[PDB]
Amino acid sequence: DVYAQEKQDFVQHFSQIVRVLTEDEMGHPEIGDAIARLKEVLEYNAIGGKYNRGLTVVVAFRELVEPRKQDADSLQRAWTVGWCVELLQAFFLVADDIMDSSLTRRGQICWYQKPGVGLDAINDANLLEACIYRLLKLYCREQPYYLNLIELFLQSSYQTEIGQTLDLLTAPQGNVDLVRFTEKRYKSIVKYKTAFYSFYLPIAAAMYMAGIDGEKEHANAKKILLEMGEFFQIQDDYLDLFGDPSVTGKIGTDIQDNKCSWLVVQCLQRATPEQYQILKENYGQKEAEKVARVKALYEELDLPAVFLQYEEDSYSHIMALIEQYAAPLPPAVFLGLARKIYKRRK
């Protein structure tokens, strides 16, 4: 709602992002075709999602900066840093789609699945990542938060890469152990792979933009935002099987890819020993009838109801955590973002 009003202005800022990334180096004409490829890379892989992470930067920045400091320029930078978060997303997703062997993202074919792209997508991703640092220098080089922002985006990438390594190490292809799929391991994976970049990064970005740089106000924000990130990823895992691909824009692969999904952890916690074996025989394999058998087993332990039950308790806990740690920040910052992910199905 605070999100939904601001969407349109934020999406229109994208034409200029692209202009400035295409223009400022087209005074080197020799790379023109590279630049043209960048444009394509951006339009295919930055557009088409819900923009919530990039919107979170703009919304929070509105709520933390005094409106007499929100000049036209200061807002440009807010929307630009918003788009920097978006490009980080795009970067990890393009590479994740390859490592996860996914088919669709945001309602279209994955970039690496497009005829004539393939594993060139690897360098496409890396460019998306560089564009972040290009814009920071363009729009924020002279701000006193410029270095905070750079360290923040770099630190959040390392964290999410450490998370992916854990994601991939725990899901080796053609190689079961059910046994590594614990709660402790799960929470660790999801903390690093999703929670820093999807929640802490954008709010912190907007904190540094407003001049709130103190270690304690960041750690407290962090406490709320990691826990919301855990919830968000459990939701992502539930939607990978039980979501509607016309809503989510994507087809699940967690069972196939042998993943430490929340579903499988819960499953294992509930399974009779012979249910265990059915899982053993059928998990992490590409065969459609073996996936279907796992799903049935999940359904047979009411894991969709266990998800709906988790969602309520997590929500109540995040809200407790907001009552606890929001101060001295406006609680609307956390509340608007919790509203945005509660009940969600894309």
Add this chain to the structure above:
Amino acid sequence: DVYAQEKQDFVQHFSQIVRVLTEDEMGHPEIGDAIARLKEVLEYNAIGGKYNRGLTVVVAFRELVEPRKQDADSLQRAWTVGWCVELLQAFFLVADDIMDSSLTRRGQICWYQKPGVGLDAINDANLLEACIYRLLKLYCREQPYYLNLIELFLQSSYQTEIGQTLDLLTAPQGNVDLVRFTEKRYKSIVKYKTAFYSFYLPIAAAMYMAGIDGEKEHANAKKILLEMGEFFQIQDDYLDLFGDPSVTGKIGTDIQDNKCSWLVVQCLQRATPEQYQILKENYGQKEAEKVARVKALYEELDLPAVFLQYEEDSYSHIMALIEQYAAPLPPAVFLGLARKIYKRRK
């Protein structure tokens, strides 16, 4: 020789690089297995090469800093930033080996060809890249060049990514045009893909470390170092076909992968029209007997002698350029590095 003395001290600094990258986050035990994977990623993909780029940082830093400023700490940082260049290399190479479909690198199997790695290598690469920025913060956070160094490593990555995009766009699989393979296009490709990160980056890194930050002293260094980078890449293209894989540590793929190699550009400049057609029919295809036919054609126009002739003229020109633009820097800086690549065959 200045290189060859300093090698051993530089390579021994690698144990500590790895220690500090493994230690400083092992106070989070939950990621321990990620960290262990990093260690592996580093030992396989940072070790085994000639270290010339990372050595160039240490050598030049010795030559530009007054020896009364080369305290133990100041040298730590030199060797560390040396290793940061090395990790940039490692990052691009791991990804290049995938996009080039290569077999071996540095005398062993490519990381992505190892059983149980595969396309997980994508995230391995990204980590290598993050490690650069981790070390900069660890060893240089309080230096007045810290931000110059960060912008330099980021800018050099964007440039080399723009170069790779050009490299890949000009070499679409199963799709000849001989016709895009010009001199102008060639020089552009090689400038961006190799010349900034392999030559300008390390010397500039060492300039910023010595407090030489002026735009004019950088542009002049740049003028020498881009041209040396062009030469170095033409050498790389010649070795891809005519090099000895026990020296180079790697097997060629430029013809197979349909690349704008220097060899093919030269070829096209020399070809009778019916030689042209032989090239047309045989270039950019995986079939061993069609590659052999191209090689024969290259040999039939004495392109190895044309390479030996280019090498001499380029050398004389780089030396002219050094006479022109080295000032006020010690010419030994450029000379030691030109000695290192003249006559080279790994």
